[PDB]
């Protein structure tokens, strides 16, 4: 089997800049003067999208910002200028021989201006409590960079376990991330405390963003 090594693995690039992804086939993928290497774009949640086929052909409908090059065993995909809708994982795939092979992929992240998350905390729904469960949910929307912390405080003290965080992939419209944290306790543990705080921190800093509520 032929090995397709993509490089780099991850790459951050500011809007308008240039993005260059490499692909190195272990063998040659030329055949009668044509290099059979294709490139796909894949945004989280959907099937890959054919961008460029046979090394340098831009599929009809693809923005001219994209452009492939290379031959033999070394190929390159070029994006200029980079846009918000480009944050995705990219793949080169050889069609030269059995079995068809895909590259190890390259995630493309967009750099932008630091942005504060929009925290919103939610107490447990009556429905949920009735069944002996209490899930406090905290939404930290549209922040940047992806590196953020979330500390949960119950009656002043920090709650360690019972937390479940889930990040969103970088937005296609504004290049921001979002995260959801859920502190899950039992109706008993919940009913025996009053103040529930959810606070976010950006890497180091010191000035957090808090949100809280009282059981009344």
């Amino acid at each position: 089997d032929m090995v397709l090594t993509q490089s780099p693995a991850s790459l951050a690039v500011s809007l308008g800049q240039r993005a260059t992804i490499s692909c190195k086939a272990s063998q040659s993928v030329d055949y009668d003067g044509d290099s059979y290497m294709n490139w796909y774009q894949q945004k989280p949640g959907q099937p890959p999208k054919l961008l460029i086929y046979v090394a340098s052909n831009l599929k009809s409908g693809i923005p001219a910002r994209f452009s492939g090059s290379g031959s033999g065993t070394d190929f390159t995909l070029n994006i200029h200028p980079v846009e918000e809708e480009d944050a995705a994982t990219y793949y080169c795939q050889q069609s030269n021989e059995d079995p068809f092979t895909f590259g190890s992929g390259t995630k493309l992240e967009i750099k932008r201006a630091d942005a504060a998350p929009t925290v919103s905390i939610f107490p447990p729904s009556s429905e949920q409590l009735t069944s002996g469960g209490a899930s406090v949910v905290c939404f930290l929307n549209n922040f940047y960079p992806k590196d953020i912390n979330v500390k949960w405080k119950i009656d002043g003290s920090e709650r360690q376990n019972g937390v479940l965080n889930s990040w969103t992939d970088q937005d296609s419209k504004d290049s921001t991330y979002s995260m959801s944290s859920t502190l899950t306790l039992t109706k008993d543990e919940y009913e025996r405390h009053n103040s529930y705080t959810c606070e976010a921190t950006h890497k180091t800093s010191t000035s957090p963003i808090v949100k809280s509520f009282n059981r009344n």
Binding site: Y36, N38, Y40, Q42, Q46, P47, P48, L50, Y53, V54, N57, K59, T89, Y91, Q93, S95, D98, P99, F100, T101, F102, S104, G105, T118, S120, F122, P123, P124, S125, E127, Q128, S131, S135, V137, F139, N141, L164, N165, S166, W167, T168, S178, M179, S180, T182, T184, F213
Partner: protein
């Protein structure tokens, strides 16, 4: 427009087998080869094999010879793939594609089929609405949430207002608490909308034909 419609998700017991379909339209079914790719959680694509709709010709990636079994049905322009003796490794997403336009690659793809190989029983989700609870309400945006917790297996489709609301939505990826799944979605709307105009969240869990419409009230 060439169109490839793949079957719904599947939860299969390990050791068993499963068959998925891929309905083609918008083109001469026999003219083009039908190809199959598998992609796994951590994301990484693998070619399974191709099939010649015309004569039932078949091409298999050595790894999948014996595991996959491509088949086709001319009269219905439908492609089939059968996976035998499933094991947890076979838990992934399978796409069917074709080279309409002869780009010598994979030009068109289906939307995928998620197969979960597991001895576990399917558990429906518990849909809980998330309301602010006596908060802001004066020309200032308001965030609402819907918590979908304790379900199995993946996936679940959350929607806001049958789909009228697409902007402001943020559906987070499911996490695995215990041996169950939990995800949540949020939607930001102008103070005008709610509580005035109705805001519902519609959760659907295919594996169990579970359809819920929880209304977000204050």
């Amino acid at each position: 427009e060439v169109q490839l419609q793949q079957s719904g998700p599947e939860l299969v017991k390990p050791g068993a087998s499963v068959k998925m379909s891929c309905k083609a339209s918008g083109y001469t079914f026999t003219d083009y080869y039908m190809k199959w790719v598998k992609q796994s959680h951590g994301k990484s694509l693998e070619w399974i094999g191709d099939i010649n709709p015309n004569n039932g010709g078949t091409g298999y990636n050595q790894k999948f010879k014996g595991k996959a079994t491509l088949t086709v049905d001319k009269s219905s322009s439908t492609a089939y793939m059968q996976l035998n003796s499933l094991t947890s490794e076979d838990s992934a997403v399978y796409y069917c594609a074709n080279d309409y336009g002869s780009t010598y690659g994979f030009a068109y793809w289906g939307q995928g089929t998620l197969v979960t190989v597991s001895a576990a029983k399917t558990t429906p989700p518990s849909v809980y609405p998330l309301a602010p609870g006596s908060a802001a309400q004066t020309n200032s945006m308001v965030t609402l949430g819907c918590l979908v917790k304790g379900y199995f297996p993946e996936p679940v489709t959350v929607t806001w207002n049958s789909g009228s609301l697409s902007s402001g939505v943020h559906t987070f990826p499911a996490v695995l608490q215990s041996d169950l799944y939990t995800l949540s979605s949020s939607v930001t709307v102008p103070s005008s909308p709610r509580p005035s105009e109705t805001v519902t969240c519609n959760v659907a869990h295919p594996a169990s034909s579970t359809k819920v419409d929880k209304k977000i009230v204050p």
